[PDB]
């Protein structure tokens, strides 16, 4: 009764997805501690979108969803509403009118590695833009010439998703950064997931 | 503040039965999983499995497997080790500790490790 | 599985000198998911380290946590005399495996 939110076992997770391949965690029917996500030393980015951070404590939702992946720290301008760019277009699209919390921390620790830390993926061509909350993980061969590929590799047929370089000796930019973002929905059901009631 | 008290000392006889209880304070008991360990005198820490205090799903060591079963109760707040088929390799202190290298919603891996420990229950089986 | 060695399996240092203790692993494993333990006489065993290099909380400051890949080290910066125990380290990369384990005792 009264179970607390496990946001601890998206934060403190050991290993977290390709952004291409983004986890959800879905989040229902706990109470909500936001005490963990202020005052935050380690998170480069902490934003919220149709919500304010204070008021996390004051309300309740239906669902939270926990999406979690591995991109650069250029690329975390693309996690959010109205963005355009690779990551944004291909691999992880916000929608408009979003409600939620980005949230984001340097990881250069946990995830580049002596020998290169090449098994975060990213999706470098798609036939069109991602909806918003769409996750392709098709590996089919980019045609990108009136040819057909027939499914392998050559002249205008390239593999849709590229490895990160993550090199320990990577610029601050170039590095490793784990996100965290915190979808909030409000439907017609009652409200699972609220703050804490004290 | 947080404390986990273990049950009293427990002799057996072979193919027997014991039950180790771990009852868990001061901390949200939901919140964080089992881990057991049992440790043979005068050497090292044998893995025993794994329980989530959330949804009750169990991971056991190979060696345990067909003779293990983990429970909690979320009411006293109080985890539990049954081990079946005893035998002399399995005279040891046997030890809950609250877990933090797995997950207990989502049963993935974490940053941690077994964080606060009971007390120990020894148990000797012999004929 | 992954197998944990630590070396030596005892370890005979000065009160106040500089305990380094080694737990080396089979495969490279994930410097976020080693711990280290200690054990003193008579008692249940206490984490010192988590990721590697985290120390517990109530752990004093002496113990520390490094390296990564195959080789990990637990040094204590100074033995005080509570610290003549057993110590352990941990992997959760794959399974869930325990070193050996190394006693540390007063060098007469």
């Known amino acids: 009764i009264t179970n607390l939110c496990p946001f601890g076992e998206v934060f403190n997770a050991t290993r977290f997805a390709s952004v291409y391949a983004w986890n959800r965690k879905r989040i229902s029917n706990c109470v909500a501690d936001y005490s963990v996500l202020y005052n935050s030393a380690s998170f480069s980015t902490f934003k919220c979108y149709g919500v304010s951070p204070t008021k996390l404590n004051d309300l309740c939702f239906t669902n939270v969803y926990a999406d979690s992946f591995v991109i650069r720290g250029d690329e975390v301008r693309q996690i959010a509403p109205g963005q355009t760019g690779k990551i944004a277009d291909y691999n992880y699209k916000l929608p408009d009118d979003f409600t939620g919390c980005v949230i984001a921390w340097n990881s250069n620790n946990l995830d580049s590695k002596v020998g290169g830390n090449y098994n975060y993926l990213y999706r470098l061509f798609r036939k069109s833009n991602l909806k918003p909350f769409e996750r392709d993980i098709s590996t089919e061969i980019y045609q990108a010439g009136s040819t057909p590929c027939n499914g392998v590799e050559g002249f205008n047929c390239y593999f849709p998703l590229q490895s990160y370089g993550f090199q320990p000796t990577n610029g601050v930019g170039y590095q490793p950064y784990r996100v965290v973002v915190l979808s909030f929905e409000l439907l017609h059901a009652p409200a699972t997931v609220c703050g804490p009631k004290k | 503040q947080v404390q986990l008290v273990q049950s009293g000392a427990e002799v057996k006889k072979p193919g027997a039965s014991v039950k180790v209880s771990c009852k868990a304070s001061?901390?949200?008991?939901?919140?964080?999983?089992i881990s057991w360990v049992r440790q043979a005198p005068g050497q090292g820490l044998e893995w025993m499995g794994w329980?989530?205090?959330?949804?009750?799903?169990?991971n056991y060591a190979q060696k345990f497997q067909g003779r293990v079963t983990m429970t909690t109760d979320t009411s006293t707040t109080t985890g539990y080790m049954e081990l079946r088929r005893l035998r002399s390799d399995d005279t040891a202190v046997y030890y809950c500790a609250r877990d933090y290298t797995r997950g207990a919603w989502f049963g993935e891996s974490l940053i941690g490790g077994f964080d606060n420990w009971g007390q120990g229950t020894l148990v000797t089986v012999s004929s | 599985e992954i197998v944990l060695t630590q070396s030596p399996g005892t370890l005979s240092l000065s009160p106040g000198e500089r305990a380094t203790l080694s737990c080396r692993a089979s495969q490279t494993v994930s410097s976020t998911s080693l711990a280290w333990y200690q054990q003193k006489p008579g008692q249940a065993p206490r984490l010192l380290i988590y990721?590697?290099?985290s120390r517990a909380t109530g752990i004093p400051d002496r113990f520390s946590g490094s390296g990564s890949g195959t080789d990990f080290t637990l040094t204590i910066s100074r033995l005080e005399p509570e610290d003549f125990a057993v110590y352990y380290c941990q992997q959760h990369d794959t399974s869930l495996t325990f070193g050996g384990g190394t006693k540390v005792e007063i060098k007469r």
């Open positions: 001061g901390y949200p008991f939901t919140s964080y999983g």
């Open positions: 329980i989530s205090t959330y949804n009750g799903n169990t």
């Open positions: 990721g590697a290099s």
